[PDB]
């Protein structure tokens, strides 16, 4: 019953579209985005990547049982971490540059220590608490890890304890994506029900619900100001939502694209976002002018993941051909 | 770039590439099998006779050929989002229990049709199995079979009934020029079940190899 009142408030609080305000602003024209390097080490299709905190390193995890650490400037491979389960669908890089966590169909997402007196990567804490595959397990601190599963539950953990201190519930379907706010105080996630719920870490329960899609969602990211986020699903519809207004702002779609999305990201100032489609191409879109800024070729099969460093120098895209291209 | 640091860096990168290449070569001389079916269709007995916390793994050895069987029934999730990991598998082993026609087998039919005509599994040949033929015999000589499906009228002979089950299972695949299906009857105690899989895999390899030469 309250849903009708909430919808009435939603339609009352919205009066203008961002197109009206941007109509007085000229677009930034065409930018030439050219590849600089190409990374060639993977045999099977790759599934994830995570940019470092110093804009120089990244990791990628593939189905051949290996996840690998590169140096982005000289394209030198530095670490090869053999796995236990050949099914790996997610990866993460610790903000302090110490840990990497990955996990797939077996109901776990392990923990690896990079900087070791041993001198080699080992597994530290095997986090086993779900009844489904894990789609994304990111990092909050050097000691708190947040996991999102196909078990229709997002689980906040604590590595040293070994047991989850808090559990999150509220999705009928299974969640496949999870993103963190810059202040490490809130985080959001979305599931196959085409809904995204703002999760709080202090008290451990959701606050608000974000809807508008009609299919399963693939990736999300916050706006860098710590107030908004943009989402991607298989309906070729990137949607934009903000924490404060709790509304729909801009629909990012086009009539000549019919395939889905796989990952999204924002530029340093949020002027433009990325989207690596199923037609093995990326697409830079003006985040305000809502027009296609350019198209990037370079792969053959399908984009799997992409991201931008902290400083904005680089952007790296991955695909099922097992090739990573560094762009500039 | 003419410093020991970056020379050592490129040396380490080259050796990491070489190690990865060797491993990728090693893990390709191996035949991967997706063992799929309903929960209580007799999978476990298949596991034991073939051998002689989510996805479960299995290993073999039989006359210089290596198999690999996965079990994807333990976990319940959105099947549409983890099936593409299984591309390049040689064959799919579908296990069905015969006794359960009157207890369900209709659901098995719906599952078979969904798994065979997958867009991602267009060109993979299917091995079939049929288990618990004994209790099928007792059930059919105690009770009729038309209650399962009245559209069929015929004798209560075990041969005719088993042939009808085989034909009903086999007529589901829509595409036949590239994909072919093998059936087999099992009585839960056989010494001739690994041989059937060996022969099916060998036939699959030969019929694929003749294709690129232009023959077949």
């Amino acid at each position, epitope marked *: 019953q309250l849903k009708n009142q909430i919808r009435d408030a939603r339609k009352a609080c919205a009066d203008a579209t961002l197109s009206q305000i941007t109509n007085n602003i000229d677009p930034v024209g065409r930018i030439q985005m050219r590849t600089r390097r190409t990374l060639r080490g993977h045999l099977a299709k790759i599934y994830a990547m995570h940019w470092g905190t110093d804009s120089r390193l990244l990791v990628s995890a593939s189905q051949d049982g290996k996840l690998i650490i590169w140096d982005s400037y000289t394209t030198n491979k530095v670490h090869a971490i053999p796995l236990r389960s050949s099914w790996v669908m997610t990866c993460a890089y610790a903000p302090s540059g110490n840990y990497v966590a990955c996990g797939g169909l077996d109901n776990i997402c392990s923990i690896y220590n990079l900087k070791t007196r*041993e001198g080699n990567v080992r597994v530290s804490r095997e986090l086993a608490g779900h009844t489904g595959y894990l789609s994304c397990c990111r990092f909050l601190d050097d000691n708190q890890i947040v996991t999102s599963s196909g078990d229709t539950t997002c689980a906040l953990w604590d590595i040293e304890t070994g047991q989850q201190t808090t559990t999150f519930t509220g999705h009928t379907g299974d969640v496949m994506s999870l993103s963190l706010a810059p202040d490490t105080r809130l985080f959001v996630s979305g599931a196959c029900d085409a809904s995204a719920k703002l999760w709080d870490v202090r008290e451990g329960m959701c606050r608000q619900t974000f809807t508008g899609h009609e299919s399963d969602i693939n990736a999300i990211c916050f706006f860098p100001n710590g107030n908004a986020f943009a989402t991607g699903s298989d309906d070729a519809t990137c949607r934009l939502f903000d924490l404060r207004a709790d509304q729909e702002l801009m629909t990012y779609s086009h009539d000549n694209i019919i395939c889905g999305i796989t990952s999204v990201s924002f530029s340093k100032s949020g002027r433009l976002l990325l989207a690596g489609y199923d037609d093995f191409n990326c697409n830079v879109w003006d985040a305000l002018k809502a027009d296609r800024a350019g198209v990037l070729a370079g792969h053959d099969n399908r984009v799997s993941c992409l991201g931008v460093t902290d400083d904005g120098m680089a952007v790296a895209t991955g695909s099922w051909d097992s090739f990573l291209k560094i762009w500039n | 770039t003419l410093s020991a640091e970056d020379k050592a860096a490129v040396e380490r990168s080259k050796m990491i590439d070489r190690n990865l290449r060797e491993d990728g070569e090693k893990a390709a001389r191996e035949v991967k099998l997706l063992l799929l079916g309903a929960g209580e269709s007799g999978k476990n007995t298949i596991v034991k006779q073939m051998k002689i916390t989510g996805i479960v793994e299995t290993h073999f050895t039989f006359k210089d050929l290596h198999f690999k069987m996965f079990d994807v029934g333990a976990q319940r999730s959105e099947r549409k989002k983890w099936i593409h990991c299984f591309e390049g598998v040689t064959a799919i082993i579908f296990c069905v229990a015969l006794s359960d026609y009157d207890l369900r087998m209709h659901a098995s039919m719906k599952l078979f049709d969904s798994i065979c005509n997958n867009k991602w599994f267009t060109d993979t040949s299917i091995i079939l199995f049929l288990n618990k033929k004994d209790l099928f015999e007792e059930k059919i000589k105690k009770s009729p079979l038309t209650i399962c499906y009245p559209e069929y009228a015929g004798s209560n002979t075990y041969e005719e009934a088993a042939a009808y089950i085989q034909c009903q299972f086999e007529d589901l695949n829509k595409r036949k020029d590239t994909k072919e299906i093998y059936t087999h009857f099992t009585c839960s105690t056989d010494t001739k079940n690994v041989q059937f899989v060996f022969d099916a895999v060998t036939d699959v390899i030969i019929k694929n190899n003749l294709k690129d030469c232009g023959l077949f």
Partner: single-chain antibody
Amino acid sequence: VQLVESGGGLVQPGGSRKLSCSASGFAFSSFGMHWVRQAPEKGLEWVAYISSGSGTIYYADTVKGRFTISRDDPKNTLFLQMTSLRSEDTAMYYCVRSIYYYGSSPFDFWGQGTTLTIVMTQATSSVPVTPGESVSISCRSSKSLLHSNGNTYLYWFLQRPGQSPQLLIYRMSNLASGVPDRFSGSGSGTAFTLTISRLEAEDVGVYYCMQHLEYPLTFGAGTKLEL
């Protein structure tokens, strides 16, 4: 983790001796290997280097060919083939480990050492210290050490009297792990100094300033600090 070495002793001139450094608690197959010798009264002097799997092996001018090197991944046993020794070859041969990539910490963990019997110069040989004060040591290089990648191939090493040395500051601007988190350094091309802030007990030792820009791996003349 522990590194232990053997093969020391006394050999008559013109003889041959085999030198080894056993490995335990780590993967030798994923680490480089280096050898640095120090005279009983002088500073360090680098010997050779082995990449992973002996892909590359260099030597200094004075040790090119007459001291060959090898490694053993499966058995984790190190080999040093030596022949025709002279009086100037006696020194403390230090089993030094390292790794090379971004974020590296070369020369981080050192063995005990073996007893077998670009020009870089340091400003002052010996400087007295007093507790609670601040003292700095400067280091000068003949040529600018800044390379095209911006990485200053400068290291400072400290050896406690009678013990194996440690890594303190690498790249002249980054602080090693396990240090008391007090030392710091700064400077510009060929102009560098080591600043000790709030010096404390057990800081008595010798500081070493070595280059890595080119590849002769030459060290400084030594810097002594005494209470």
